[PDB]
């Protein structure tokens, strides 16, 4: 029995409190350093110039911020897309002045979530189950990559990525609306439909299952105590739930193969989020949503406003104000 | 052309609105386009020296064809909409143009990610089928019940 073997075995063991696996060798150190740097920076990071115009923005708790206003400000616009690790700066203070911690945290977080997907698959393989949970987890990973990496790549600067904070997230969303018209993009519509449908189906499935629960408890005891871990029979009556659902809407319209029902539950939000991440990715290369500006014209030629023109008005209001000092020329290219 | 001394006019932030210095020291165009200082185009290289954008060439040896090329490129930027309105999202729809670069990049990025998803799905299924539990668990040889508790 060699040493390598022994190791490989401990690593791929399924009796450890938390599964390590080979993807864990990438997930654990990377996520740990990302979270350590994030926690330190959220508390004591000095101001950073993000627009590269020598106007630093404070985002740390010790610099007069609260939980909502605080954020990890993305790297400077002067750097752009350039790689900026610690050792390329002449001093740590300068590294902090140009927003290096944002790059560090975001790159490590992306590697960590990819390794997290891999580790999910690896444990699925070890336990002898069907290996497609990480496919479902791919959708949030794709969304995070689009918002943190793909959009800066398309725009050409890391300063365009989503800042790690609440108010920073809202600022990113508003500027995205102004410069890109996300709402009128069919992929954002698909994503909103997917999220609303996911909530709808979650609530309805939970209500239908809990409503039809076999009576195996008193009244002075939590209904949840009727079920025992490791049961052999279904604690709920599918027949009653399907009868209620069919009578509610229609007989034909109803799922019976609970397997098909759960597959649909998995399918709806996942495809919605995939389509949304594709909206963000496509719009990172300036393929914006529909522009129905001045589409309606009367006989003479005068323009009649629609509801889209008021959206354009709000977009103009946001646009002429964002990054007030950064621009020097009429067009935002 | 108006006679303003280029490379001496401080910008609104005091940084310089026409000529700046790159973080490596090279002389580049100012404004928000300082993020794109890595650019190398055939119509702008004639003006570049070893130190960056040469100033004596800009002040004296400028060419009309460069002006025409720059105007045409500014007037045709890779900006557009799904219905191909063209221009900025807030612009009215009179022009009809979306750059083929945008089409190619967006379409192929979409296809590339969905083929990555295909890789994930098929790799998982292929390995599960080779192992022999791509249809279920077993219900009589469930591996979870044979492992130590935790």
């Amino acid at each position: 029995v060699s040493l390598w073997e022994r190791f490989c075995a401990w690593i791929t063991s399924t009796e450890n409190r938390l599964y390590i696996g080979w993807f864990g060798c990438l997930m654990f150190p990377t996520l740990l350093t990302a979270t350590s740097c994030f926690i330190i920076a959220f508390i004591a990071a000095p101001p950073v110039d993000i627009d590269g115009i020598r106007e630093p923005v404070s985002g740390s708790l010790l610099y007069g911020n609260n939980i909502i206003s605080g954020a990890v400000v993305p790297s400077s616009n002067a750097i752009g897309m350039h790689f900026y690790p610690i050792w390329e700066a002449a001093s740590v203070d300068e590294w902090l002045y140009n927003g290096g911690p944002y790059q560090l945290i975001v790159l490590h977080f992306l590697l960590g979530v990819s390794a997290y997907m891999g580790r999910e698959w690896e444990l699925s393989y070890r336990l002898g189950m069907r290996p497609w949970i990480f496919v479902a987890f791919s959708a949030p990973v794709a969304a995070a990559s689009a918002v943190f990496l793909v959009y800066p790549i398309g725009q050409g600067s890391f300063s365009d990525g989503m800042p790690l904070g609440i108010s920073g997230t809202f600022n990113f969303m508003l500027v995205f609306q102004a410069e890109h018209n996300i709402l009128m993009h069919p992929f954002h519509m698909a994503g909103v439909a997917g999220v609303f449908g996911g909530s709808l189906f979650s609530a309805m499935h939970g209500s239908l299952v809990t409503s039809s629960l076999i009576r195996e408890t008193t009244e002075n005891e939590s209904t949840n105590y009727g079920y025992k871990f490791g049961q052999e029979e279904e604690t709920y009556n599918i027949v009653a739930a399907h009868g209620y659902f069919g009578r509610l809407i229609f007989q034909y319209a109803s799922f019976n193969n609970s397997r098909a029902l759960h597959f649909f539950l998995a399918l709806w939000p996942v495809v919605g989020i995939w389509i949304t991440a594709m909206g963000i990715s496509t719009m990172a290369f300036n393929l914006n949503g529909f522009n129905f500006n001045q589409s309606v014209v009367d006989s003479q030629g005068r323009v009649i406003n629609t509801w889209a023109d008021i959206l354009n008005r709000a977009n103009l209001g946001i646009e002429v104000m964002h990054e007030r000092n950064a621009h020097n020329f009429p067009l935002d290219l | 052309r108006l006679g303003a001394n280029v490379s001496s006019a401080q910008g609104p932030t005091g940084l310089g609105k026409y000529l700046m210095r790159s973080p490596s020291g090279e002389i580049i165009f100012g404004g928000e386009t300082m993020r794109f200082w890595d650019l190398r185009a055939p119509w702008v290289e004639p003006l570049r020296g070893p130190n960056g954008l040469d100033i004596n060439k800009i002040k004296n040896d400028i060419q009309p064809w460069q002006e025409r090329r720059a105007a045409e490129y500014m007037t045709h930027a890779p900006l557009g909409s799904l219905n191909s309105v063209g221009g900025v999202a807030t612009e009215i729809n009179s022009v009809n143009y979306v750059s083929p670069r945008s089409w190619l990049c967006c379409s192929h990025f979409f296809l590339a990610f969905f083929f990555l998803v295909g890789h994930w799905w098929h790799a998982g299924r292929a390995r599960a089928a080779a192992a022999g539990f791509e249809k279920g668990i077993d219900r009589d040889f469930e591996p979870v019940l044979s492992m130590t508790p935790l």
């Binding site: 508390i43 010790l62 609260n66 939980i67 | -």
Partner: peptide, 29 residues
């Protein structure tokens, strides 16, 4: 001075998360 309160709240939440993973009720069959 409120930075102290914010830090305390965040660290307390993290500690609660820590106790819910390594000090959980073991589910038995």
């Amino acid at each position: 001075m409120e930075a102290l309160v914010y830090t305390f709240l965040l660290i307390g939440t993290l500690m609660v998360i820590f106790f819910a993973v390594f000090f959980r009720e073991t589910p038995r069959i």
